Design a protein around this ligand. Structure first.
Ligand SMILES: CC(C)CCC[C@@H](C)[C@H]1CC[C@H]2[C@@H]3CC=C4C[C@@H](O)CC[C@]4(C)[C@H]3CC[C@]12C
Length: 581
């Protein structure tokens, strides 16, 4: 009979000599030189050396597959046919010459019954139409998926259909367009006034927007007439993997270099910005030539490293080439680590900056408090009847004015000498009015308070109104740094979240995809043999919404840094260049 009784075990390898197996179970009973599937892989590795004889290899492939890795299903294994065995004797007679034929490979009808339907005869080892979606026939050995011969992994992402590709593409279109023209607006602002806007750290924003401009250029390069397929796909319609590979158009690695280098420089310029802010608050242009070197070297070294390990992969969905798609331990290495360190450092100099800021924010506010006390107490004194209120409020004025005088790089400067003298006059007159108030003389002290008013205006109002507008500037800086802080931290948190999700479930997504590939590989043979075919699908796939969020995060960063130039002071600068008369 064409069937033998044995226990079916799962295929440890779903490929038989470069050809996908349409079944999932096998048995090592027919392979009388093997007891386990590991042994089977060893013996087939021994048979592998016969591939240098295409004439024999072509004819011995189906026999070897039908014997060593047969289809087991429901406790039954199908034995290879007599004809199949006879198709091997004539061309592979060489095997009989050197070492002879194994007894289980001899065409004895007990091993190879006559007229038995075999599942392998349907399989074509040289793929004319064997290549089944998501695989495309490529004769280039650098594109072949795993060990499979003739078939390569298709270019377009086999996890998302066209209907999703168009969606994500128009999404990226919109966002990257907004970013490219916003960044272009910032650039144009700091460029038309290149003579007046070239200052630190105001030019650091210009550099950030420059980087995020180049990056968005790289992101938009995929929208030309047939450029996308030129960047993402190889010459044989298989997705570019492990780039840069030899003898392939550099249309991919260029885009990768653009996107990645521009991104990394664009996010190290953040650290430079925070440092520049801290040093600006702590007080200069002595280290202004050293920031460049870091911000251009580190992304360069990183990019060169990625090109050195050749881990540039092409994505049809995003429409670009980026690091660590296939191997997710590279994206976490070259994206999450630098961005993370950037977050740490920039955060450090941010909080340092707002500490250097908070230390003065309290001082100025205290001086203002003293002034407040002076004003309200003068309000009470000028308009009062009881001579106790005058004494009290004059004492309070004395305390407040004394406390204000005890404030501060040179305490011996002529300004500090003068400022304290005014409070000497004020405190003195306050004490005179105090002497008047103690003796019960109400209206005399009240009349001696107007002296305090005119003296307040003359000697104190100067420095006060000088340090009155600063509390607005300091608060504006504080709140805009609050903005930048709680925004950048948000973006980093979100992108770290997305990247971590993909990093988490990529271990399962590959499993699902592989199972799917095997399933459709079964469908291929199952169709052209009038056999019942099973519906195949992907068990689980990456969420498009997550990628949407990540893109929204990075492009959101690209937009939020372009918004910084959007001020009322900018709009008028444009007019100076061409207003004429
Ligand atoms: C004819 C001359 C050039 C020798 C060619 C050697 C190669 C092509 C062939 C000839 C005979 C073949 C062997 C025949 C018998 C066996 C025993 C089996 O359990 C393992 C495979 C093994 C070991 C084969 C390996 C491949 C083999 C060694």
């Amino acid at each position: 009979k064409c069937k033998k009784t044995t226990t079916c075990e799962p295929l440890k390898y779903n490929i038989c000599l470069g050809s996908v197996l349409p079944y999932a179970l096998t048995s090592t009973v027919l392979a009388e030189d093997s007891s386990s599937q590991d042994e089977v892989h060893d013996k087939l590795s021994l048979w592998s050396g016969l591939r240098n004889a295409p004439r024999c290899w072509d004819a011995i492939r189906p026999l070897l597959c039908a014997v060593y890795m047969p289809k087991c299903e429901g406790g039954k294994v199908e034995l290879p046919s007599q004809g199949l065995c006879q198709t091997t004797r004539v061309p592979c007679a060489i095997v009989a010459r050197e070492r002879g034929w194994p007894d289980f490979l001899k065409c004895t009808t007990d091993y190879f019954p006559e007229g038995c339907p075999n599942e392998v005869q349907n399989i074509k080892f040289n793929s004319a139409g064997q290549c089944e979606a998501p695989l495309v026939r490529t004769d280039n050995p650098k594109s072949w998926y795993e060990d499979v011969e003739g078939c390569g992994i298709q270019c377009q992402n086999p996890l998302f259909t066209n209907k999703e590709h168009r969606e994500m593409h128009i999404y990226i279109a919109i966002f990257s367009s907004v970013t490219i023209f916003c960044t272009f607006f910032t650039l144009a602002t700091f460029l038309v006034d290149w003579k007046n806007s070239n200052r630190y750290p105001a030019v650091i924003l210009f550099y950030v927007n420059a980087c995020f401009f180049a990056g968005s250029i790289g992101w938009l390069a995929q929208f030309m007439d047939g450029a996308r397929d030129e960047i993402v796909c190889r010459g044989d319609g298989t997705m570019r993997l492990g780039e840069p590979t030899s003898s392939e158009t550099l249309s991919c690695v260029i885009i990768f270099i653009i996107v990645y280098y521009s991104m990394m420089s664009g996010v190290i310029w953040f650290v430079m910005l925070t440092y520049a802010w801290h040093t600006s608050f702590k007080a200069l242009s002595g280290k202004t030539s050293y920031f460049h070197l870091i911000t251009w070297s580190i992304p360069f070294v990183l990019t060169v490293a990625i090109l050195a390990v050749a881990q540039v992969d092409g994505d049809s969905v995003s429409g670009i080439c980026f690091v660590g798609y296939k191997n997710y331990h590279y994206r976490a290495g070259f994206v999450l680590a630098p961005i993370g360190l950037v977050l740490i450092g920039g955060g450090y100099f941010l909080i340092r900056g707002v500490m250097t800021l908070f230390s003065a924010r309290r001082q100025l506010a205290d001086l203002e408090d003293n002034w407040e006390t002076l004003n309200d107490n003068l309000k009470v004194i000028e308009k009062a009847d009881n001579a106790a209120q005058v004494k009290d409020a004059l004492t309070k004025m004395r305390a407040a004015a004394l406390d204000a005088q005890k404030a501060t790089k040179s305490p011996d400067s002529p300004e500090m000498k003068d400022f304290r003298h005014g409070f000497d006059i004020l405190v003195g007159q306050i004490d005179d009015a105090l002497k008047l108030a103690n003796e019960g003389k109400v209206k005399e002290a009240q009349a001696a308070a107007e002296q305090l008013k005119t003296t307040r205006n003359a000697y104190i109002q100067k420095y006060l109104e000088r340090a009155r507008s600063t509390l607005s500037k300091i608060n504006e800086t504080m709140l805009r740094l609050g903005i930048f802080g709680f925004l950048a931290f948000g973006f980093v948190l979100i992108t770290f979240g997305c990247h971590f999700y993909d990093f988490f479930n990529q271990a399962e997504w590959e499993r699902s995809f592989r199972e799917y590939v095997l399933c459709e590989a079964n469908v291929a043979i199952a169709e052209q043999t009038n056999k019942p075919i099973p519906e195949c699908y992907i068990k689980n796939r990456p969420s498009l919404l997550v990628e949407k969020i990540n893109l929204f995060a990075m492009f959101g960063t690209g937009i939020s840094m372009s918004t910084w130039v959007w001020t009322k002071a900018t709009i008028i600068i444009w007019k100076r260049a061409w207003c004429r008369i």
